[PDB]
């Protein structure tokens, strides 16, 4: 109510006393190949497999990707 412009950008200041907790929202987590997210915050990095040389890993990752991709086809694959 301080301003009519609300969406494009706003500043919180900790001198202002409010928060909200609308349970949960759902959003996709970023792919490693673009984000590399772990190495920025320096956690115990997962081993970066390659997609070729451990062929069963390619098998499993494709098996899961089946169901990301089939979401556009609407079939629930139950993989």
């Amino acid at each position: 109510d301080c301003f009519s412009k609300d969406n494009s950008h706003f500043i919180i200041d900790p001198n202002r006393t409010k928060l909200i907790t609308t349970n949960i929202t759902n959003r996709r987590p970023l792919p490693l190949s673009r984000s590399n997210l772990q190495r920025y915050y320096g956690f115990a990095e997962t081993f970066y497999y390659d997609l070729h040389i451990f062929p069963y890993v390619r098998q499993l990752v494709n098996i899961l990707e089946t169901s990301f991709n089939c979401s556009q086809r609407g079939i629930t694959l139950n993989a």
Binding site: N62, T66, S67, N69, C70, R73, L77, A79
Partner: protein, 103 residues
């Protein structure tokens, strides 16, 4: 055939006909056949990108690896599979033995 129809619509479109794999799948229960067909259906996203799995005898690849709920425990007898062609020169006996078996 009923199970293939009960999956989301797909077809055996190539000139293969069901009796081929039926003769290829003697030792199976109905539940096993439901599972085996689901394993075939997963081709639709594991290997093909097509919305329909034209089958191209892919069964010959997967049915070698899948197994029924029968055939459990490590027990074998037909493993050597050398056939009657691999006779040990039973020239005076293979005749009567195979005759007495076959008649």
């Amino acid at each position: 055939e009923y199970f293939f129809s009960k999956n989301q619509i797909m077809k055996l479109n190539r000139d293969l006909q069901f009796s081929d794999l039926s003769l290829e799948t003697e030792g199976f229960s109905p539940l096993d056949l439901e599972i085996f067909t689901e394993k075939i259906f997963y081709d639709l996203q594991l290997e093909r990108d097509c919305d329909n799995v034209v089958t191209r005898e892919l069964f010959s690849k997967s049915l070698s690896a899948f197994t029924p709920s029968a055939l459990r425990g490590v027990k074998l007898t037909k493993e050597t599979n050398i056939k009657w062609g691999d006779i040990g020169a039973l020239a005076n006996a293979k005749d009567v033995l195979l005759e007495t078996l076959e008649w």
